[model samples]
Target: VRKNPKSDKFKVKRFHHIEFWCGDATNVARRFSWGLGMRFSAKSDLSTGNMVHASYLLTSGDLRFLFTAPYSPSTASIPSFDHGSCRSFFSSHGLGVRAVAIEVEDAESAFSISVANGAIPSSPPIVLNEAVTIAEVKLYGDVVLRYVSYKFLPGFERVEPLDYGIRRLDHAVGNVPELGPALTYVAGFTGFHQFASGLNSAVLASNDEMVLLPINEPVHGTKRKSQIQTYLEHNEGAGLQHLALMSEDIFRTLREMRKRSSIGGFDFMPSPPPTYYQNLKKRVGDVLSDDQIKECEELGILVDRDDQGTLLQIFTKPLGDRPTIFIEIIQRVGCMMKDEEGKAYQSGGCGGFGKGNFSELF
Candidate 1:
């Protein structure tokens, strides 16, 4: 499929970073560092005299995360929300993604278009001296979308590394009570278009029931009650569901995480039953060799493929007790190739979340 022309509104280069409001930035940063192979990239605290909050920057592959926690108990200084405190957010939502940053060439244009296209304005552009400028707009519940200019902001200090093989952010999944409004907000309001359209999933397991949309797709549900509903009921509102991180060699990455699981107390997605492997072989036919299938089965990886390419993926259990957020590791194969005409051809994947693994994963 041919790509659409760039939006005149604003160009979202890529996902810059995701900020999480947590009870403890130190512990969260440590968990990511030791368990998932991320390293400390930068930091801010009272020692730097920021006064109100502390932040820890962690990086893996090309993904960056800013985890922040407040120094005070008051809710008075936080943005737009009436219940406006990082303290309140942590108390109500536990550890959750509060903001998603989109890198842009111009923050002013990004903010102007976002508001003009119907995004709820949260914060106006603020230039931090000559180095950086930032703005924010509200998107889906209390989650804020930040249009940022990064140039080594003044107060932050650099830190060291662990060099985990995790490479870049593959996708981000958001859970909402209603899909239509969210889809309208993201696609029509913010200039994001649907890719590999119409892919959907329904999971009705013994413990949980939910419907899923494709990578960045959106969905609303029925009266039967879905896991998305459960998340809203538990989290008090909508928030990020999971982040898919790409890896060059997923098998080696999973093996490393598995080895660290026991030592770090990490909970990986439970393995699919033996019957799953049997069915996977039959379903995939000869696309995957027996050895590849065996290795995937051993590592609890789920494979989604089509004529174009195959995507290998797996999830980690929620990092905390709320079951609100998790992580997905994905690796793509056979997607890009050269055609007989000596031209380059690239094919997209099956475009569905690993439906086969849904039953066991949830």
Candidate 2:
């Protein structure tokens, strides 16, 4: 598919924050704070005068998460006649990501571009506070693309920082039934270029390449339904499948998460067969010490690499009962250990989305 000439004009800068509309935002917020080390930064609820929903904001490095639980009531926050359409949303999609905010230079212009370029708008630009302006474009399933002007939405109180060395988002993948149209539509308005990937995945990236969205559509009629199709059905439709969080150190991150698994943190998938890790050195080369490799096997972390660099990644099991959305912990180690601290600190995607590890993940 070709890029829309007019869409070369979107002013998206980076990922602002991902807002999750769930049934229990407060409980999950506390779990993330205690388990994953994402500290609570701000909130809006009964105490804050917004009785419509209970919302919590958590942050770690450039990664921000907004967790909200609807009250099946209102604050004039929503004008829907049904009262709790928010509850209905969760009922359909279950616990999943609803919006991904792109920090754009021109939210209104980009939104207009989207609406005019065949993308439908859920709402026009609205000021959440003095510093932030947000606009939404309704997309596949219940998910929507968000254009944000700035960070911090009105309420700001400093939350205690943790030593969780997680950095920014590496990528968030989507599951769509129709791959071609979905790819074209998103690229047409968002100016997101379709990059090469597996047969199941068509990666879309912002102009700056900071945000990578890997979209997957189930391959048709084989034996049974494909995994992507399973996700689509189980999720009630197309939606965000999994998001990868780039960590500063995968060893420490997984270690900390494992410690909290039985309590606050989520569980991880089982490790691959013994042979998969038995020959890890021959396949992935010398990216880590033998002790580290053993630890990875023990912790269920997978390793893969391209000609340029190495990737260490692992996935948390479904965040809830329904296998809709989960979290991916990733660390991109460059060919060599050189810090880009002086210039723009470029990290993640060095190993190229674990092309080899995809099979193991399944």
Candidate 3:
């Protein structure tokens, strides 16, 4: 199981966003659509010194993210947001971080699922040698999740005419060491059904205070840095640890991205204190509503509510220099995957294993 030599030819051409580095980028896209509420539609770039890639199209209710920041060809895009750029760019340049982007249908099923999951295939799906053939499926989480079709974007029938924003691939987070055999070997075929061991999570502060954690089940944690604990301690245990971004109308798009100030680019990390909701009203008691738990403690954000409804998350502290990846901004509400003519369905929804806030990050 180690074959993937590059013959090229792929499909699944949807999700196209995931790149970070923000010192200002319009205040981290106005605190991710208005102070952690999320919902924006368009953003692009092409001019300037000609090397400051940018893209932001988000949603939170049903999730639809596409955050990009290309052009590092020489250095100008790191205004600020350094989680350590994934082990300082793979220890000075061994280069290992493509970050989960599996959109396959061809390309040998992306080399037949990365050689049946032993994954070591780097490039084996060509055709996009120029104007476009959109083919990709390189894994080991560094960034290359492509595989477009429509016979190579001939206008894609006017962009699907109407599927409204295109959605799927709603979950992606990694740190891999063994977390239940890497979530059962990535749920076999990325099915990702469910997982929740020692779970318990919460985050919301600035004045609300609730930074909780309980995680320790990456197969009985032993703490290496924990949070899944081993991308080779920023080297190679694996990669990608965040990429949640999905939405619908998270509080009017985080209030018009904070009344159009764009919240001032991200670099956060200071939320948790109000006795962490003293056990969330005695462990999910009243089913939420002291103003919906003070509107998730004044929007520092983090719910995961019950009765099959709420789910508004938040996370984005490490923006570069790889503290080990970071970026999650969900917004689910009653299982979504679409079907019955609505479209977009494959099932990988409703994940609740916060493991007490990822065991408070080791």
What stretches of model 1 exceed 4 Å from their correct place?
Answer: 1-8, 73-84, 150-152, 197-225, 282-288, 337-352, 355-362
**What is the lDDT ranking, best to worst?**
2, 1, 3
TM-score of 3: 0.27
TM-score of each: 0.82, 0.89, 0.27
If ranked by TM-score, best first, what sequence of candidates would result? 2, 1, 3
- Please give the range of 10 consecutive residues that has the lowest summed lDDT in model 3: 204-213
Model 1: per-residue Cα lDDT at residue 282: 72
Q: Write the per-residue lDDT of candidate 2 for residues 330-355, one digit (tens) a residue.
A: 98887444566555455425787888
Q: Which residue pairs overlap in candidate 2's backbone?
A: none
Runs of candidate 3 exceeding 4 Å displacement: 1-119, 122-125, 128-130, 133-152, 159-171, 175-217, 221-243, 246-249, 253-275, 278-293, 297-362
Estimate the Cα RMSD of every predicted model relative to the unseen true structure.
6.5, 3.6, 20.6
**How many clashing residue pairs appear in each of the predictions shown?**
0, 0, 62
- Candidate 3: tens digits of C-alpha lDDT, residues 1-362: 11222222223333434433333344455455544444565554343232454544554433444444444534122222123453354444232224333334454464555446554444454443333333334333344344332221121111111122223334555454444544444333332233223221221111100111111224344434344443336544556556555555444443433344333544544555566655455544455557656655555555555433446666666545556665555556654456686666332234343324534322
lDDT for position 9 in model 2: 56
